[PDB]
Design a protein around this ligand. Structure first.
Ligand SMILES: Nc1ncnc2c1ncn2[C@@H]1O[C@H](COP(=O)(O)OP(=O)(O)O)[C@@H](O)[C@H]1O
Ligand SMILES: [Mg+2]
Lengths: 49, 409, 460, 250
């Protein structure tokens, strides 16, 4: 019971730590680059107007 | 004779374009074709290859006459063509002729007068129409159409006009659209009953590399072929830096009857290659987040063959003797062997995967490292040091070598 | 009742700027009046008065302003606004964007002269449209169904196959069966290949005697595009409301029309709207799009299908944005489906028809049509929401229910949306292909469908 | 040496004539006296901001970030004043220096400069923070004239092949380093660990140098081969078999 738990629990930690890393290194930076582009383009439209 | 450059030279009739324009690139000639009488745009960031594609297409193609317009671009590049093209020869009746004998250049460099950039464009297409009228197939290169749009903007500013998007004049889209309408395949005026064409290839230089640029965005509303270049391919030294996900050609149906006569095996291979590259793009987004370990063996094959195509088919160095120019026999032969290996590797996995002992891509790798290395090495065969017969015989021998390896599985 | 008085001719040009000529010393100038210009080499051009103030008049020139000069060029003022000749003999003819012949036939011998701006139809005299057009296309006839007398544009983008969609509708359109269309076709700023494609398809379909073409190409003058849709619609109103025909009207790039309006408005130095377009562009587009429908006691109709190209694929751009506030829905053509080689590339989520709610159902089509239409839409919306989740979490996180939506979404694009350019599915074939996809789910998940429709149609 | 100096407290409109005085002096030295001239222009970013200041005061058409609508054409009148001419034994080489605002290479100043100049050398804050010197990052950098200044009789026969294989290995090593931040070291295959070893040795041995160390091209190429041999020759897929068989066994 301890070894079937331990081997099943080790897998779920790896999958979870991979999501914490992917959100920190891949997903959040893509949102921040998008959001920085939008602000830059809205300054352009304002200067054209 | 003398002709007004702002007026179109007349023709008896305009014709559908049925015959390819051959660039000597494996990408382009296979994946995104163009035609005699076609219109093309090449947008990209700085240092992507817009000039090198334009010069390579000018050196090695099936056109009778080349008109090269360099408006708003470097003086060292017009000097490069004047150095390079006299030394470079095509062969005619068993005799060599310099490609400068079929070429004319129009220059107005980035430090020359800004209003003369417009004069260069209309001069170049008027010279191109004049040779079309002799019954020639002409290609006109415009080394950046963005530099003419930028000249329209300064004059519009000093005339104190009301602008459209990004300060450009409201007439910019009509200027571009009526310039590209001067391309086509034609019955000429007059009575020796001949035909000719102009193909136009226009580079575009979107500022910051952003294709939402008003000049790019107007241009893609007009042209029938789009070769979109990527700065992330150029920074890897992956050349030609053509993004195969965004790029397209509208002429692929017109060329059906050409390939169905001359290269009857090709359209299935082209179709499979686009599917492998699109499947890899869907896998790669999963792989980046999930970490590759969950993949099926047919997906590991798909990733590896997409990598083989991306690295060893879609990639050429234009400044080395074996890949300066790639013939369509070498192009169809290379793709045939890569797609053949894919179908065999996929069959071996898919057939055995139900059994207690079964094939995997890792087994195929360890069994076939020499065939994989031979497949990556197909590109290095030289179309003028080696013969057509020698190249085709070698590619047939690779097919026997890989068939004997899969028989051994 | 004729203008029997002599025309005044002036050599009083005072400025030339973009598409505009300015005159002075003009006698009682008239707004919207037509002018004929003769250049020093004997070339003739035509134009319209855009503004008057005292003895000064501003003229837009339809064929452009090259070679005009302030001393020898002369302008004849015609005494009247723009009235086009009309006749029923205009069917089986080809004209340019000015309505001049290009088929080597003669000029139109008029049955009447009509003002290209039309006349306002009283809202009391309109008939509400309820006759369904079967276009043959399942993504339309199933989920965006079209009433005869509607206006519904195709919203598209550069490189997409919107011309094949429009041509297929011209081949396949007719009424639902438990009459045929006259076609009026306007091209503004098309390439020669587009003009050849449509013209060749009407010749090859053998129906070229029941179509009228007005062609302005990308090498023709931009300012003719201002009048091209208005010549097409003035022809359709004669055929529909005097000759009692049923007319289908195609306006093949309203984006090139809007760009020509921006050229003139910028040249006049007016206060801009959004993206530099005229501040009156809603009102201008409404005078084109509202020229459609049915009228009391006349047995004819006009249906409009405009076509748009969205710059940078953006539906929030002024051209598609204003068009959605006037037209009764849209058909949206999608680069995502086109890159997957689905044809038609129609995305059913942003697509709409505002008149289908009354054109379908018992006696109109079949009683299940609304329920299938709602349930297919709901499943495809949920399938896209599942797919967007799955792309992060991977397939092992999905329920059996999520895999039913993901299977439905693949099957719906392969079977319902994909069709091919000459396949002509009825409404009834379309609705039964719909049930073959709703069969992917147990009845407990089909929550938009009432139990009587489930009981009658699900078990088949 | 000739020095033209405008400082942070000197008039801002002198800055638009300063580089034109320098380039006029270089043209006399190169094309009348037949010297070889090296021209250094310091903060073209200050030139371009002085140009924006002048053009804004005239109410001229703006381009991106409010820069003058003609700034490409203006910068081209500076940068095209370089090179060699037929029948004269002098030359002008230009090395302008830019500060990219907020480190952004897509900003109008580096953007329009990269469209005119024959490549760029790119100095990276992330290499400087790590105390590497010189902080040059090869991937954003370019030389357009390199292709025909190198090879047999020019430098050494391997130079192009070595260079392109170093670009390929550095780019793949950088993609493994980005991937390892998601999946950790335990998920890497043995091939990933080769590119990740190359990445670390390349920055210490090839890039890092110090301010008075002066390496020959031949020293640079042999440092290059010492790093390419980290891999089996079958992984060196940019290099043709003739170049491998001659230079790899060393
Ligand atoms: N096909 C190619 N093969 C080899 N090198 C290339 C190729 N295409 C581009 N390059 C390299 O990249 C540089 C930039 O190419 P260029 O055409 O001048 O870029 P762009 O016009 O897009 O700004 C070239 O000078 C060359 O060094
Ligand atoms: Mg260039």
């Amino acid at each position: 019971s301890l070894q079937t738990s331990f081997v099943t629990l080790d897998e779920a930690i790896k999958i979870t730590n991979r999501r914490v890393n992917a959100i920190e290194h891949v997903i959040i930076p893509r949102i921040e680059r998008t959001l920085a582009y939008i602000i830059t383009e809205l300054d352009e439209r304002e200067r054209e107007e | 004779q003398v002709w007004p450059v702002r007026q179109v030279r007349p023709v008896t009739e305009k014709l559908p374009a049925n015959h390819p324009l051959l660039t000597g690139q494996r990408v382009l000639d296979a994946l995104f074709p163009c035609v005699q009488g076609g219109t093309t745009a090449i947008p990209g960031a700085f240092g992507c290859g817009k000039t090198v594609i334009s010069q390579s297409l000018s050196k090695y193609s099936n056109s009778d006459v080349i008109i090269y317009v360099g408006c708003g671009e470097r003086g060292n590049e017009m000097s490069e063509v004047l150095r390079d093209f006299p030394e470079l020869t095509m062969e005619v009746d068993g005799k060599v002729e310099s490609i400068m004998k079929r070429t004319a250049l129009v220059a107005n460099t980035s430090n020359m007068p800004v209003a003369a950039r417009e004069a260069s464009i209309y001069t170049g297409i008027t010279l191109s129409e004049y040779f079309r009228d002799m019954g020639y197939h002409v290609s006109m290169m415009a080394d950046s159409t963005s530099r003419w749009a930028e000249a329209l903007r300064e004059i519009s500013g000093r005339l104190a006009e009301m602008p459209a998007d990004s300060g450009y004049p409201a007439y910019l889209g009509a200027r571009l659209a009526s310039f590209y309408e001067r391309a086509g395949r034609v019955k000429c005026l007059g009575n020796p009953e001949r035909e000719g064409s102009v193909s136009i290839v226009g580079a575009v230089s979107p500022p910051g590399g952003d294709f939402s640029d008003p000049v790019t965005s107007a241009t893609l509303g007009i042209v029938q072929v789009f070769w979109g270049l990527d700065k992330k391919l150029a920074q890897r030294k992956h050349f030609p830096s053509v993004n195969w996900l965004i790029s397209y050609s509208k002429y692929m149906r017109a060329l059906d009857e050409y390939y169905d006569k001359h290269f009857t095996e090709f359209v299935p291979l082209r179709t499979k290659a686009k599917e492998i590259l699109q499947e890899e793009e869907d896998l790669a987004e999963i792989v980046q987040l999930v970490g590759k370990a969950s993949l099926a063996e047919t997906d590991k094959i798909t990733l590896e063959v997409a990598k083989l195509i991306k690295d060893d088919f879609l990639q050429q160095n234009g400044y080395t003797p074996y890949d300066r120019f790639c013939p369509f026999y070498k192009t169809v032969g290379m793709l045939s062997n890569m797609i053949s290996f894919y179908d065999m590797a996929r069959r071996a996995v898919e057939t055995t995967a139900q059994s207690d002992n079964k094939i995997t891509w890792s087994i195929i790798r360890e069994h076939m490292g020499e065939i994989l290395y031979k497949l990556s090495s197909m590109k290095f065969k030289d179309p003028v040091k080696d013969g057509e017969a020698k190249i085709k015989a070698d590619y047939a021998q690779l097919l026997e070598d890989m068939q004997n390896a899969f028989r051994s599985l | 009742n004729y203008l029997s008085q002599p025309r005044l001719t002036y050599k009083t040009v005072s400025g030339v700027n973009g598409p505009l000529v300015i005159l002075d010393h003009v006698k009682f100038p008239r707004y919207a009046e037509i002018v004929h210009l003769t250049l020093p080499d004997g070339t003739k051009r035509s134009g319209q008065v855009l503004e008057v103030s005292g003895s000064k008049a501003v003229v837009q020139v339809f064929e452009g302003t090259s070679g005009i000069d302030a001393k020898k060029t002369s302008c004849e003022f015609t005494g009247d606004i723009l009235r086009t000749p009309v006749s029923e003999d205009m069917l089986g003819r080809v004209f340019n964007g000015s309505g001049k012949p290009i088929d080597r036939g003669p000029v139109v011998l008029a049955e009447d002269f009509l003002d290209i701006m039309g006349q306002p139809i009283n809202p009391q005299c309109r008939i509400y449209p309820e006759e369904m057009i079967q276009t043959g296309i399942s993504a339309i006839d199933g989920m965006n169904s079209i009433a005869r007398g509607q206006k519904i544009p195709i919203f598209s983008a550069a490189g997409l196959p919107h011309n094949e969609i429009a041509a297929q509708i011209c081949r396949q359109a007719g009424l639902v069966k438990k009459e045929n269309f006259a076609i009026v076709f306007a091209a503004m700023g098309v390439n020669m290949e587009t003009a050849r494609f449509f013209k060749s398809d009407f010749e090859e379909n053998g129906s070229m005697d029941n179509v009228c073409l007005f062609l302005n190409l990308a090498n023709d003058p931009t300012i003719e595009r201002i009048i091209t849709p208005r010549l097409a619609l003035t022809t359709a109103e004669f055929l529909a409301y005097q000759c009692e025909k049923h007319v289908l009207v195609i306006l093949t790039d309203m984006s090139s029309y809007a760009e020509a309006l921006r050229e003139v408005s910028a040249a006049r130095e007016e206060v801009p709207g959004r993206r530099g377009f005229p501040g009156y562009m809603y009102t201008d587009l409404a005078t084109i799009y509202e020229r459609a429908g049915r009228v009391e006691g006349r047995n004819g109709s006009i249906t409009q299908i405009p076509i748009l190209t969205m710059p940078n694929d953006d539906i929030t751009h002024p051209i598609p944005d204003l068009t959605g506030y006037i037209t009764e829905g849209q058909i949206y053509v999608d680069r995502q489906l086109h890159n997957r080689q689905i044809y038609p590339p129609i995305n059913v989520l942003p697509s709409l028809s505002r008149l289908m709610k009354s054109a379908i159902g018992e006696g109109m089509t079949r009683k299940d049509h609304a329920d299938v239409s709602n349930q297919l839409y709901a499943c495809y919306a949920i399938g896209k929401d599942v797919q967007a989740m799955k792309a992060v979490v991977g397939e092992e996180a999905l329920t059996s229910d999520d895999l039913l939506y993901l299977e439905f979404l693949q099957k719906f694009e392969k079977n319902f949306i994909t069709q091919g350019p000459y396949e002509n599915r009825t409404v009834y074939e379309t609705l039964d292909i719909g049930w073959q996809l709703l069969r992917i789910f147990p009845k407990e998940m089909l929550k938009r469908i009432p139990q009587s429709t489930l009981s009658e149609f699900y078990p088949r």
